[PDB]
Amino acid sequence: MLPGTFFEVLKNEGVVAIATQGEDGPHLVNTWNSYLKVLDGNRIVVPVGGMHKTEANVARDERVLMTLGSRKVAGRNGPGTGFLIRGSAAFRTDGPEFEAIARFKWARAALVITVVSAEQTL
Ligand SMILES: Cc1cc2nc3c(=O)[nH]c(=O)nc-3n(C[C@H](O)[C@H](O)[C@H](O)COP(=O)(O)O)c2cc1C
C-alpha cells in the first residue's frame, strides 16, 4: 500500500533507485520516472535493458528496496523529495508490465516490483 503522494511524485520527473538483493551484495541501481510504469494493486515496473547484476540478483532473491523521488517537489536534499519503499521483484517478458514498457526500444525485461510498504525520507 502507498500514499497518494507516492503516485504524485511518480507523475513528475525524478530519479529512482532499486536495491536488488541477490547474494554477492545488493546492487542499488538507478532509473527515471519517465521510464517507469505503475499498475493496480500498487505493482510498479522498471524497464531492465542493462541491469545485469540486478538480473542475477533477482534470479537469486526477490528482495528489493526502491527509493523514488522528484525534482519538482521540495524535500530535505535540495528541492527534491522522495520515499524509501520495499517489495518483491520479478523479471517478466510477458504481461501488462512488458506491454506498457514495450513503448521503449532497449528493454530486455520488465523488472516488475510488487511493492508492500513505503516511508517518506528524502
Ligand atoms: C540515472 C540512471 C538511470 C538509468 N536507468 C536505467 C533503466 O531504467 N533501465 C536500465 O536497464 N538501465 C538504466 N541505467 C543503466 C544501468 O542499468 C545502471 O547503471 C545499473 O546500475 C547497472 O546495473 P547492473 O550491474 O545490474 O548492470 C540507468 C543508469 C543511471 C545512472
Swiss-Prot record:
Protein's cellular compartments: Cytoplasm
GO CC annotation terms, alphabetical: cytoplasm
Pfam families for this protein: PNPOx_N
Residue stretches spanning the membrane: none
Keywords: Cytoplasm, Electron transport, Flavoprotein, FMN, Transport
SUPFAM superfamilies: FMN-binding split barrel
Cofactor requirements of the protein: FMN
Gene3D superfamilies the record matches: Electron Transport, Fmn-binding Protein, Chain A
Free-text function comment from the UniProt entry: Functions as a redox protein with a potential of -325 mV.
Quaternary structure note: Monomer and homodimer.
Name of the protein in its database record: FMN-binding protein
